UniProtKB/Swiss-Prot annotation:
Catalytic activity: RNA(n) + a ribonucleoside 5'-triphosphate = RNA(n+1) + diphosphate
Organism this protein belongs to: Hepatitis C virus genotype 1b (strain HC-J4) (HCV)
Regulation of its function: Activity is up-regulated by PRK2/PKN2-mediated phosphorylation.
Function text: RNA-dependent RNA polymerase that performs primer-template recognition and RNA synthesis during viral replication. Initiates RNA transcription/replication at a flavin adenine dinucleotide (FAD), resulting in a 5'- FAD cap on viral RNAs. In this way, recognition of viral 5' RNA by host pattern recognition receptors can be bypassed, thereby evading activation of antiviral pathways.
Residues of the full protein shown: 2420 to 2984 of 3010
Cofactor annotation comment: Binds 2 magnesium ion that constitute a dinuclear catalytic metal center.
Protein name as catalogued: RNA-directed RNA polymerase
Length: 565
């Protein structure tokens, strides 16, 4: 069975695609080696197609079957509610792709007669048709990176596949409660998306100290979505079907699985037949939940197959991490191979093969690793951080250009306590915002695939609840960490961390200069930037923040939105 078959029609762009950075006012203010920054375009689509296209052998053993039964037993506890038309509409991002039937996102959110009617008819059709493949668009995704050790070598665009707006809203009705609550009910503590960054590191740390001589590794799956099989996808259904369901929900799930999830026809932007898909669609509501379940399922079985001991897993979509019990260095190496052999049998071979690690800090997962720091009190505080190359590169892009999602805002939220987010990302963007009377203006960003609309002036409170007040006092970072950042700043041509200190003090002062929510930011976000530290008490408005459904589940590909009415 092939992951894809192609007809020859091209993956076409819908609009003008821009591949390089413009030389802008404040582009260079952040990053001067602009010819290292690039966005992906449909030009590289055929490259990615070569990569994701292959036949899949899959050989299930008894381990697998045991674990699946265990997962199903836990799902059987779940009661999933069917979403009302309205509730599904409110979960649609206002800039989600319009439907081919003469209405878009705002039509759905507004519950316009045309949209509501067709959404209804698409639901009706799910009951009345159990076989006909639902059509999908395929699109080359635009993402920004910096180039790395070849070079002149860029990633090819990733490929997104989605059904029409009307189907997407039906998916929500049928399956939004399922994908939001069943992962935790089945994998529990191993479901990564229930964890804030603070909560995540806490788990990882605890897990590590809980082992006597802990061993740890991450597992990278070679183009995961393509490795997913129709069998995988039906198994995933059998888990879903273990819930208590409304009768229409049950049929909806059965129909979407056959007509959409297991596979279907790929159509480009010009409306041409591009070929067929027999693997994970990356743009459906079930993508994150399916991926996480499938990963956790195959991972857990391949442990038993590898006779690994006292394993504990963190699973986030297709990203897997395992902290277990060391046997011996040569025995560990052998065990990790066995894990890989088995995963390869479950149709999940590796990107670059896994390597045991004996420092928690050297394990990467979710493009993240743990590092250590100290708060004002000198106490040893753990937090989570990445190589800032990709985040800064996109920070340069969003500076120059109008982008629908501000990854920088997201990254500051997720990586508040980090050295580079405080000294650069905050410093950079808060001068810009002040210099353009745009502090109160709320911007769109993503957390775990979901879209939120946030005012930058409510960053401290958000930051405090997600990380602690320590994230405003942290210092004495790791040498490896500080060397990673500084080395990155060379690469991109960013002003070295000395430089940013003075820029911050300016903005901080400029921010206190106005009092109110503005001053709260200068006082909290840029405390690192002064010798005479301010007193730092709790935030008044941290009290009543909406951080409901902020870190419950993953949704990358799911067309999900959680800001206000």
């Amino acid at each position: 069975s092939m992951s894809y078959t192609w007809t020859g029609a091209l993956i076409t762009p819908c609009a003008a695609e821009e591949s390089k950075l413009p030389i802008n006012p404040l582009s260079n203010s952040l990053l001067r080696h602009h010819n290292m920054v690039y966005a992906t375009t449909s030009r590289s689509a055929s490259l990615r197609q070569k990569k994701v296209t292959f036949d899949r052998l899959q050989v299930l053993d008894d381990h697998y079957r045991d674990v699946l039964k265990e997962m199903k037993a836990k799902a059987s506890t779940v009661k999933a509610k069917l979403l009302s038309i309205e509730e599904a509409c409110k979960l649609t991002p206002p800039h989600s792709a319009k439907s081919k039937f003469g209405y878009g996102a705002k039509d759905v959110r507004n519950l316009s007669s045309r949209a509501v009617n067709h959404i209804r008819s698409v639901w009706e059709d799910l009951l009345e048709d159990t076989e006909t493949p639902i059509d999908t668009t395929i699109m080359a995704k635009s993402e920004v990176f910096c180039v790395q050790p070849e070079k002149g070598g860029r990633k090819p665009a990733r490929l997104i596949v989605f059904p029409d707006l009307g189907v997407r809203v039906c998916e929500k009705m049928a399956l939004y409660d399922v994908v939001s609550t069943l992962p935790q009910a089945v994998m529990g503590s191993s479901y990564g998306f229930q964890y804030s960054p603070k909560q995540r590191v806490e788990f990882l740390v605890n897990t590590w100290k809980s082992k006597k001589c802990p061993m740890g590794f991450s597992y990278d799956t070679r183009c995961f979505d393509s490795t997913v099989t129709e069998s995988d996808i039906r198994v995933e259904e059998s888990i879903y079907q273990c819930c208590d369901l409304a009768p229409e929900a049950r049929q909806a799930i059965r129909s979407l699985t056959e007509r959409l999830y297991i596979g279907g026809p790929l159509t480009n932007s010009k409306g041409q037949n591009c070929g067929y898909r027999r693997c994970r669609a990356s743009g459906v509501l079930t993508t994150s939940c399916g991926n996480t379940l499938t990963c956790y399922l195959k991972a857990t079985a391949a442990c038993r197959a590898a006779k690994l001991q006292d394993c504990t897993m963190l699973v986030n979509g297709d990203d897997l991490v395992v902290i277990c019990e060391s046997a011996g260095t040569q025995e560990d190496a052998a065990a990790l191979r066995a894990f890989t052999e088995a995963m390869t049998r479950y149709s999940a071979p590796p990107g670059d093969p896994p390597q045991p690690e004996y420092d928690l800090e050297l394990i990467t997962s979710c493009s993240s690793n743990v590092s250590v720091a100290h708060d004002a009190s000198g106490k040893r505080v753990y937090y989570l951080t990445r190589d800032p190359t990709t985040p800064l590169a996109r920070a340069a892009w969003e500076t120059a250009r109008h982008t629908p999602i501000n990854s920088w805002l997201g990254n500051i939220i997720m990586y508040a306590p980090t050295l580079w987010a405080r000294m650069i990302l905050m410093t950079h963007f808060f001068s810009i915002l002040l210099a353009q009377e745009q502090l109160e203006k709320a911007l769109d960003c993503q957390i775990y695939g979901a879209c939120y609309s946030i005012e930058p002036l409510d960053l401290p409170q958000i930051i405090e609840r997600l990380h602690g007040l320590s994230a405003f006092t942290l210092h004495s970072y790791s040498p490896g960490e500080i060397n990673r950042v500084a080395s990155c700043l060379r690469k991109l041509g960013v002003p070295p961390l000395r430089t940013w200190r003075h820029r911050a003090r300016s903005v901080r002062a400029k921010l206190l200069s106005q009092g109110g929510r503005a001053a709260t930011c200068g006082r909290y976000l840029f405390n690192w930037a002064v010798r005479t530290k301010l007193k730092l008490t709790p935030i008044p408005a941290a009290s009543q923040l909406d951080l409901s459904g902020a870190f419950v589940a993953g949704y990358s590909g799911g067309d999900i939105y959680h800001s206000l009415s």
